[PDB]
Amino acid sequence: MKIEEGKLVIWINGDKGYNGLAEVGKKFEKDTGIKVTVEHPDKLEEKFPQVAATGDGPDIIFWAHDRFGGYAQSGLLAEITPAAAFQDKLYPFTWDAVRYNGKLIAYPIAVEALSLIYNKDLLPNPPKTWEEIPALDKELKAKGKSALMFNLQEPYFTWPLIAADGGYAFKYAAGKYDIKDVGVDNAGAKAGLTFLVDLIKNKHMNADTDYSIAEAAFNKGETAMTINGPWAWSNIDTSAVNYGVTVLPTFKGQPSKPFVGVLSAGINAASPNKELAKEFLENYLLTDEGLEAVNKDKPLGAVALKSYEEELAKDPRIAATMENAQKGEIMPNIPQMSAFWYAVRTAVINAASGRQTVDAALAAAQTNAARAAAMDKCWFTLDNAHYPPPSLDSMRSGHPISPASLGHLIPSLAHLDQIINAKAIEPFPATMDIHGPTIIEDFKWNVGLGGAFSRSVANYWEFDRLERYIMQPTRSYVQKCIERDEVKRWIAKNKSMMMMGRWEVYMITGIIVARGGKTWGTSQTGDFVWAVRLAKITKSGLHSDWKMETVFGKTSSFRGQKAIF
């Protein structure tokens, strides 16, 4: 489904209640006429940043909150603006889970955590410790069953055992997550992963077990236990298994520490239906009846809406979910969490199969997570210049004064003195929002932009803040830009035959303003555009429609500047 004004496209993982969500979308369509298309594509948490950059993703994306901070860093999420009356309807804990740089960047839906699900008929008294599971599996293999089966392919399900005796992702200190203090290869994490590998080495579990294998085995009554969240309860209801939901087993006397996720709905920063999305999420989904329809499809856990949460609070399965959640930790939403998960996923798979030892798997995972890096760089400093920032009022004016303002078309970064569309910027359509000012760095005079800024600005200490203004050009907006007389005449100045039917232009699609308040004076202490983001618009020939992409890494020219961040 293609995103378009007048419709809503929603992405939600295939294990959630997407049919119940679609029913809420049908009611929204009945009242308003706005069609709501719900989809559950594979690997949506990885597809979203790619398709959202191209402006061809969903209007609303559902996922656990850990991914949304990385989306917010890239500016892919619209800041949600709920009234105080609506914020009072949701628990403050859930609002805190969807906060990035102080701003709310998603609507919290429900708190979810892993629990131990056991067959009350096969196992009337579940084991309280991980250590007693081998002996239990031996007795259950004698009766034609197995003790425990759960998804060994995703680190989300193995992590509670890994973190039980001291494993952790990123240490929280000084009010921040220290991305250089990873606890993936410490003694606690080694003991946890070793116990898991020993369970496989002793044939108590198979390292190839995934989500489908474990769900089918438990719902058929072939294994006495599994580990899963509330979304899986309804499938067990359909089966003939009298099941229970209780605490995860302890390890070395310590409780298993599941990573607590908060299912959240973010709004695409490039969506042209932000008001429709806000209306659907606030007035239809985040209601007793919208959440009821979703929860009846696939249970959500402890929902964020206080009214429906109080209604479901008597459910003992929710109480077990809350107990495991209290014994665990909330997931960080820092952008490095994606690298953390990939590293731990590789480590568990390589240790469970025997490809690597536990020490070698976790050591490589520690390095890859702390070396998250790979932050594809698209920001170029404006060297040998001090361009004052454009006022937010003038950015939509069609003729901003500063050369470094959004919408300006330049031959190259080295030719910011040659604005092609100077004072003739094609009007931004009402769908193209300018996202900003976004505080990306609070200066208080390694990690952060302080090093790049201090190395680039002689009077760096005289500025306290960096503010980002981002826009995303649409195909139709660029088509109107390249059809204006200023661009047509600039293209027509070509004299070469090798460039006939060929062109390239750069559009300023992002600015980062330094806010304050060799010998330099008062002019250098004033605000200025420190960095810019560019989109390269190119037509390669007659039979090729023009393409556009954000300039990453470096620019292609003589003295091609390198992207600092």
Ligand X SMILES: OC[C@H]1O[C@H](O[C@H]2[C@H](O)[C@@H](O)[C@@H](O)O[C@@H]2CO)[C@H](O)[C@@H](O)[C@@H]1O
Can residue 298 be called a binding residue for ligand X (CB under 6 A)?
no
DSSP 298-343: S--SEESBHHHHHHHTT-HHHHHHHHHHHHSEEPP-STTHHHHHHH
Smallest separation, CB 286 to ligand X (Å): 18
Which window, 62-70, 94-102, 419-427, 432-440, contacts ligand X (CB under 6 A)? Answer: 62-70
Can residue 156 be called a binding residue for ligand X (CB under 6 A)?
yes
Can residue 111 be called a binding residue for ligand X (CB under 6 A)?
no
Can residue 39 be called a binding residue for ligand X (CB under 6 A)?
no
Rounded CA-CA distance 220/340 in Å is: 34
**β-bridge partners, 9:** 37
Q: H or E element: which one contains 244?
A: strand 243-246
CB atoms inside a 10 Å sphere around CB 50: 10
Between residues 301 and 510, which has the closer beta carbon with respect to ligand X?
301
Can residue 131 be called a binding residue for ligand X (CB under 6 A)?
no
Can residue 170 be called a binding residue for ligand X (CB under 6 A)?
no
Q: Spell out the residues 6+ positions from residue 21 whose beta carbon is closer than 8 angstroms to its own.
A: 10, 12, 38, 62, 285, 293, 294, 297
509: buried, middle or exposed (CB in 10 Å: 19+, 13-18, 0-12)?
buried
Smallest separation, CB 383 to ligand X (Å): 38
Which window, 148-156, 178-186, 312-320, 544-552, contacts ligand X (CB under 6 A)? Answer: 148-156
In whole angstroms, how large is the CA radius of gyration of the chain? 27
Q: Output b/e per residue, 160-185; b: 16+ Cβ within 10 A.
A: bbbbbbbbbbbeeeeeebebeebbbb
Which window, 149-157, 193-201, 401-409, 501-509, contacts ligand X (CB under 6 A)? Answer: 149-157
Can residue 154 be called a binding residue for ligand X (CB under 6 A)?
yes
> Would you mind telling me the total number of residues written for the chain in this entry?
565
Can residue 329 be called a binding residue for ligand X (CB under 6 A)?
no
Q: Which of 108, 127, 261, 390 binds ligand X (CB under 6 A)?
A: 261
Between residues 15 and 462, which has the closer beta carbon with respect to ligand X?
15
Which window, 80-88, 150-158, 387-395, 507-515, contacts ligand X (CB under 6 A)? Answer: 150-158
Task: Report how far apart the first and last C-alpha atoms of the chain are (Å, whole number).
Answer: 34
Alpha carbon separation from 7 to 33, 48, 171, 325, 327 (Å, rounded): 9, 18, 42, 36, 42
Q: Which of 23, 59, 66, 185 binds ligand X (CB under 6 A)?
A: 66
Which window, 63-71, 248-256, 314-322, 404-412, contacts ligand X (CB under 6 A)? Answer: 63-71
Amino acid at 504: E
Q: Spell out the residues 6+ positions from residue 530 whose beta carbon is closer than 8 angstroms to its own.
A: 381, 382, 453, 456, 457, 466, 512, 513, 514
Q: Which of 58, 70, 155, 244 binds ligand X (CB under 6 A)?
A: 155
Q: Which of 13, 295, 333, 356 binds ligand X (CB under 6 A)?
A: 13
How many residues touch ligand X under the rule CB under 6 A: the total is 12
Rounded CA-CA distance 144/182 in Å is: 42
Site string for ligand X, 211-250 (x = CB under 6 A): ----------------------------------------
Q: Which of 67, 274, 327, 435 binds ligand X (CB under 6 A)?
A: 67
Which window, 27-35, 60-68, 249-257, 371-379, contacts ligand X (CB under 6 A)? Answer: 60-68
Smallest separation, CB 67 to ligand X (Å): 5
CB atoms inside a 10 Å sphere around CB 527: 17
Between residues 182 and 481, which has the closer beta carbon with respect to ligand X?
182
The contact set with ligand X (CB under 6 A) reads 13, 15, 45, 64, 66-67, 112, 154-156, 261, 341
